Symmetry: D2
């Protein structure tokens, strides 16, 4: 089997997307711009596990353009875009992913990306940990062949840190999830753009003059609050951390407990990443037709079960849009059944945010692979200079003119003209 796609007749339609997305993903394109000749990953056989979408497709072809051997599989049974997957398979790349697979076909798709024409994979590019996990639990033999790993998710990195603590980790990893260019875009800037896209696409509701309660003031809460605020809404924040809470207050946001906020909000967004954010006692207080959605942790922040078990009626207005009737006589509009609203009611993050996240993947791959004896078994952070690098790949499209430190100023600041410009503890 060369690959397994739903319909390869879709390839021609996928390429169209790829060539449009490319213009919005400068990181990946500049990667090809400076390395496609040097082929830094020449020799590597990257087994990738990442949702197969137009953006991910652009990444793969970049990995390939840098001289790498690549085998791909999605990291979610549905997340994969078929015309994008088809174009890859059709590109002569082995991809095993179709939208809506079985937990059984999924594990198989992955198993396929482990062995190449010249042998087994020597590098991992994971989003979620499944790839890295499957190898460790079932293919420990191959382990000694993989030069390094690449993780871009909290979950993925958490388990990575866990395995390591258990001496389980045998191949060194690079945590690209905590890069500022990755995090800021994945969390802050991304949700800032798509949050309202979801709410509007599901309700077409006016945001101005409304009270929006955003639970949590982390990067996502920050982007969501900012987003809503720009539309004319009165954002109220809830938090458990004193520092994030203070950050919000300092910005003009009222900070209360959900127990109080629930009686005031017209729109509710959870950014927590923790359980029991919006409960039944809150729903009973919410104004009529309050919109409740979640953009943090998949479906565990809102108590949907309660809505299902206590509402007098429930009518699906449209896909990912339900409107419950409470015994108190008030209606509650729920979005995406409590799952991520930006992905469930919108198209998720814009390509540009993807460009930063993925370029980090390329950055990691190029480094691990290129520096064989540099990283001991363990989950490391992406060297700052590399993080700074993915940032610079986007300046330009943004049409930003970066100034260069003179030898004099560099010496004054006691730092390299190109070398990292900030300490590791620096929080931008």
């Amino acid at each position: 089997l060369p690959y397994k796609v739903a319909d390869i007749g879709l390839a021609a339609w996928g390429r169209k997307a790829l060539d449009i997305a490319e213009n919005e993903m400068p990181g990946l394109m500049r990667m090809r711009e400076m390395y496609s000749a040097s082929k830094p990953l020449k020799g590597a056989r990257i087994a990738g596990c990442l949702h197969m979408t137009v953006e991910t497709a652009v990444l793969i072809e970049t990995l390939v353009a840098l001289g790498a051997e690549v085998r791909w599989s999605s990291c979610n049974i549905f997340s994969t875009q078929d015309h994008a997957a088809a174009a890859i398979a059709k590109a002569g790349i082995p991809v095993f992913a179709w939208k809506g697979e079985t937990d059984e076909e999924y594990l198989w798709c992955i198993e396929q990306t482990l062995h190449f024409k010249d042998g087994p994979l020597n590098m991992i590019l994971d989003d979620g940990g499944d790839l890295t996990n499957l190898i460790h639990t079932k293919h420990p033999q191959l382990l000694s062949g993989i030069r390094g790993i690449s993780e871009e998710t909290t979950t993925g990195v958490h388990n990575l840190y866990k395995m390591m603590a258990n001496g389980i980790l045998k191949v060194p990893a690079i945590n690209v999830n905590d890069s500022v260019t990755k995090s800021k875009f994945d969390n802050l800037y991304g949700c800032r753009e798509s949050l309202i896209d979801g709410i509007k696409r599901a309700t077409d509701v006016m945001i101005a003059g409304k009270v929006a309660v955003v639970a949590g003031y982390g990067d996502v809460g920050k982007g969501c609050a900012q987003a809503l605020r720009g539309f004319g809404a009165r954002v109220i924040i809830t938090e458990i951390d004193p520092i994030n809470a203070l950050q919000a207050a300092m910005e003009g946001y009222e900070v209360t407990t959900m127990d109080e906020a629930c009686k005031e909000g017209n729109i509710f967004v959870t950014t927590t990443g923790c359980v029991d954010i919006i409960l039944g006692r809150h729903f009973e207080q919410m104004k009529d037709d309050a919109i409740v959605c979640n953009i943090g942790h998949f479906d565990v922040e809102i108590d949907v079960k309660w809505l299902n078990e206590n509402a007098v009626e429930k009518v699906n207005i449209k896909p990912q849009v339900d409107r419950y009737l409470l015994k108190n006589g008030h209606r509650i509009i729920l979005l995406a059944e409590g799952r991520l609203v930006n992905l469930g009611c919108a198209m998720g993050h814009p390509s540009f945010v993807m460009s930063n996240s993925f370029t980090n993947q390329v950055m990691a791959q190029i480094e691990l692979w290129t520096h064989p004896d540099k990283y001991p078994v363990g989950v490391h952070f992406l060297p700052k200079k590399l993080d700074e690098a993915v940032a610079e790949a986007h300046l330009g499209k943004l049409n930003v003119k970066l100034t260069k430190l003179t030898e004099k100023q560099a010496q004054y600041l006691g730092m390299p003209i190109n070398g990292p410009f900030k300490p590791d503890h620096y929080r931008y």
Copy 2:
């Protein structure tokens, strides 16, 4: 013929919409709250010409709930929503409108709303002027029967002022288009919400870090500029009026000529309402894949013909999304073929903005009809106290607590406790 709808089997699905929109249209609901008993329009036979949509539907039932006899027809061959029209016809109301009619069936639908069981229409509720025009040019006999007119559009009002200047106007009108609650919502607040809805639905493009050039700084340009600015874009304004231009400068926006701005922008929005805004000489300078859309005057602001006649390729990416290839090698993404992007790539204005516009209609109808000898033939402005009134109908849903002037303060300010609080020349 009782009515003419595409499919009355749609009624049940329309009602659902109506009952959802109602919650977002307080003006109309409060109208019923205080007048449905007094039936202020009791005796009137309103012939209405307004796109038949869920929002317009809610309005009609409010006119009816106030004791009026109503006959309806859309004011655009396509604008009419059928499940919303069906529910009206099914409600026992005579509506003549289906999406996609012929210029012939359109004139007929209108002709139908002129005669009631008890005689001909005695009142007009028009959006566009067609109704008022058709009567004047073809049914002058009825003219002496209509107590008054209601116009809510510039076009509609312009022609009204014109007819009057020609002594053609025989029935007094009330220009509700220039009410601040009507205008601010229809122009400022509405486009502020939907502009980005359009661009995102068509391109799913990241707005932050992009240069947006908004041509014109009127109410629409103001809303569009504010909207984009909140997303992280660098808005550059163009203008012909020194006062609007100054207004923009005072707010931090750079103001230049399109001739220069064209070489800098990534997104282009026209708010002008005038011709020749974006020409071929501009396209030839725009960056690769610049997005160009219009939200002002229907399709006359951008030079689409040129794109059609000078591009090397043209490919429809999706409905209302075309991507031209210029001889210079750059691509230009055009939205809604130069027509309104919020209506052509999104769902138009939210119900709340509709609630303000329509409540003005109800306000006008109630006044003209209720004051037989108050208004001489001529296009008048909606009394300020009525404009203030539609505003108050929305405070509350907005959860705004308006304070009341004491008799002392009222005497001090030399104004009524409820009477108008500002002079006519006041610009909020």
Copy 3:
């Protein structure tokens, strides 16, 4: 007597100020740029009554540079800046104004500006109405000699409208107070800049994280709210007008009654222009050390008498800064004794706002005087094209590049290439 200044030895120090202010007052400078040669006011003998300050000084010399004969007096016993008045007197111009005059010397100063070497004044440039009043009540003989009046204040214009209603008005006036370039700057933009200057200069208090209650959402409330909001404060608005209240809600501001807001705010600003805004019942609820100031109507919005009559202690922290101790144990910091905080705790409005207000004066003077039989006795509004004109005098320093309508677009828009670009009813 040639003039009456406190100390003419101050002249050299005044000129320094004048030459610095000039750079920030383009309107007056462009006036001289295009009219100092044509001398449009050649022949006029302007009797002016306007606080004698550096800005006003720049204006006078502009009136003079345009070929006019000018005699000046301040319109407030203290508002006059002496080094600015001295430089004028020293410039060979007759000015009768010193800071801190007696209600007796004030009336005399004014009486002096009525007669010139070539006869009595034939034009009035008033700010307050005193000049125009004094002539009407005591010098009716001169009345027939004055070609026109210029008023730039509400008070002034109110009385102007009153006199007219009583057939008292004998010389036509031009209400420049309602120009958008005058109003927006005097009210909106000015207070936006100076409000915080006052609070900071009096308290040096951090604004971020604080709740600021702004009473009134008119032009001043708008600027004050915007100002505070930008500093990170949570602004709560109070209003009696539904339209202004809605405008605030649509912008994300909570709107309540002072009765409730008083228990929440940390800073209080009155923008009302009406009495009994902050009363004793409010003070008793205010948080400890709440800052209360007024920027609307001079000292009638806050109930200071109550503070004086009910506080347990009162200690003057510094000029224009008092801190009362209430029986409840809470302290209340009052600013400028309830009088205007921006003038009383800061330097008032920046020169640029003055430039717009004054250029209006020049604009009015040039028009009335130049068009002898154009204006019938009555208070008229400044022609829009003139209002637009003062706006354009500032574009440039702002470095704004206004685009010019082509003959084609002008015809399309049905408006002049330079002629007014908007209808009188237009509210920018």
Copy 4:
């Protein structure tokens, strides 16, 4: 000698200040609220070297209220406020500081805080390093007596890291300068408030409609850019770091080089902290009367010498306000002679920012002293839980209602209900 103050007759006036500042410094007040009874610092003899001001005064009395023995001296010859210093000395506390001391009396003032009635100091609270340095270079004998150090400045901490690298450091330190509550307030929030206070107090210039060029987008540049933006200016950023540069672009700011920006700006702010930011080649291009000031590193960012050596004229407009005339005919307004504008043209940071910085000091002192064998010789970071703690001391005055994690959620999140809520690598 018990202490050395300029004038102890000033004490009574100092106390007034102290009791006003206290209300704006909750951190210090809550410190006393919970520890004044337990006297956590009971036994310590703190030798402090910190500018003696009203704020610092409040801190000292807090250290004393916690059961500590304290001896104080300023860390700048002028920074010390005398009425604040007098009230401390008068309070029975030994303070050696007066505004305007000699580099000789300064070293002596410090020497005084080294020995107590019960022996030498056993703890250091330093701002700058002088204290810690003086002991190391001249009093190594005492070294073994000090349980720990507290540094809150970059300079101070830099040297600390340096000494340590040279094995010189003998007593462990705690870098409180890098706490987020310290840094965010000292750098971001503080300068955001005072920047404009400076410019306005020196020039009283309108900010709106002006182009402000902020060099550097670090914490200060962020606050300064945000500040100016809120006033209506068009902020242009310059940067050497790609990440900060991208951060700015993503927020709507144009990013260029000073070499280009210089030809556009009206106001110039340096936030760099590096040399040669604004040079003569820039001045020669700046618009007429451009305002140039520095708020970053004391006087090394702007090339003042050049202005001095190349201007045709130089006239001091007022203290800390000079206006040079260049050979090109343009004038350049310089603020605070290139030194910090917020301190030199304004009153510096508001008390609240001081409250966060100082509470960090108290936090450090309480920890080091209370945990004798917890910290090995070396510069450590303030435990996150302590940083979170100083944050919570201010929630409340801000009237923020922090929610508490349930045992369930805490277990889910795998974190303590009160324990730190974020990893060390977390950048808020």
